[PDB]
């Protein structure tokens, strides 16, 4: 079910966040949901991390030039190739964790690309995208995609 999947997306995102460190940790983690999505309704209700920090989420436009300073995390929906390039031009050089809802465009762009709809959520990770992100991501995060 879509609700069931949305909650699973919320949990895997919280899981991934726990393996990430920002060079300047905010009081409130800012998440922007960008582009059409199926599984973000849970995210958008807001979350709390196990370290006590609130995650504030809202939808922002694909063509907002300040995405890189308006969030710590971007959850990227189904956007075409022009839009996708636009988004990552905006993010370049900002310390932003990027996660895409679908798992097919992970050659460039997002650090993590989810696969939702199987018995369990998995993801691909692009280490080059991670290296360029400006945030620290511990390799043991990769265990979340397995088992």
């Amino acid at each position: 079910s879509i609700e069931q999947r949305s909650n699973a997306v919320s949990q895997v995102l919280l899981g991934i966040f726990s393996y990430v460190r920002w060079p300047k940790e905010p009081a409130v983690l800012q998440l922007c949901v960008v582009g059409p999505t199926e599984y973000a309704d849970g995210l958008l209700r807001g979350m709390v991390q196990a370290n006590g920090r609130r995650v504030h989420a809202e939808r922002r436009a694909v063509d907002n030039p300040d995405l890189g300073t308006l969030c710590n995390v971007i959850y990227l929906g189904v956007v075409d190739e022009r839009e996708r390039q636009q988004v990552f031009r905006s993010l370049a050089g900002h310390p932003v964790l990027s996660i895409s809802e679908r798992g097919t465009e992970c050659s460039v762009g997002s650090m993590f690309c989810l696969n939702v709809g199987g018995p369990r959520i998995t993801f691909e990770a692009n280490l080059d995208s991670i290296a360029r992100s400006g945030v620290r991501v511990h390799p043991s995060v990769l265990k979340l995609a397995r088992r």
Partner: protein, 124 residues
């Protein structure tokens, strides 16, 4: 779940220095990059990852066909290091994307340098 919060200072091998970059028109690695790759390879195996996809890239200088081949040779050079690090040969997929998917601006020397790369992808 959220056990990453227990992590301290060890093993953070995916930082800025972990990019796998190549010199202009080069498809071979030098000691700085091969050392970098072995550390990445060891980090992955340490967290029970035994399967990767390697995607090679070029900047946009020259014709498309030449760059397609160059990108494949780059991915092959990285695969060799993964094999020698202990990753099973059959678990390493190699792909060349040529000049088609730049991560940086080809209009600058610095940007072209960033584009000459192999991206290590850890599949689901």
């Amino acid at each position: 779940q959220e056990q990453g919060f227990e992590l301290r200072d060890e093993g953070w091998e995916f930082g800025m220095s972990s990019k796998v970059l190549f010199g202009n028109n080069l498809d071979r690695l030098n000691p700085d990059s091969r050392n970098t790759l072995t550390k990445i390879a060891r980090a992955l195996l340490a967290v029970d990852i035994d399967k990767v996809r390697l995607e090679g890239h070029t900047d946009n200088y020259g014709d498309e066909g030449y760059n397609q081949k160059l990108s494949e040779r780059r991915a092959e050079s990285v695969a060799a290091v993964f094999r020698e690090a202990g990753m099973p040969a059959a678990n390493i997929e190699v792909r060349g994307l040529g000049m088609s998917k730049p991560v940086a601006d080809n209009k600058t020397r610095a940007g072209r340098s960033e584009n000459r790369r192999v991206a290590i992808i850890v599949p689901a």
